[PDB]
Amino acid sequence: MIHELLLALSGYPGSIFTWNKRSGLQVSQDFPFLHPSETSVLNRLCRLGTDYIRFTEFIEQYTGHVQQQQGQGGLHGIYLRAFCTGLDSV
């Protein structure tokens, strides 16, 4: 629960925080070791690691992936690659 949370937030989902691509990271939410008081906190915590995984996936997808030739601003472009470059350091 301790390391597994850091694993899930870091970009390494376990089988505690079950990664879906239609609901991001979501905690199991059906077991007797999470209670309604804890439930809101867990849901609040899942979203940040979801954002982190999507950010890293975007950066690896769009920097250093072509040998340059194509005209596109959503899939390609030096400025998009520069966005990934700034985004990782932030």
Residues in touch with another protein (CB under 8 A): 63-64, 67-68, 78, 81-82, 85
Question: Residue 68 Cβ, how far from another protein at the closest point, in Å?
Answer: 4
Q: Decide whether 1 or 78 has the Cβ nearer to another protein.
A: 78
Q: Decide whether 37 or 68 has the Cβ nearer to another protein.
A: 68
Residues with Cβ < 8 Å from 18, sequence gap 6 or more? 25, 26, 27, 28
Question: Residue 66 Cβ, how far from another protein at the closest point, in Å?
Answer: 8
Q: Are 19 and 31 in contact (CB under 8 A)?
A: no
- Apex CA 20: angle with CA 11 and CA 83, to 5°? 50
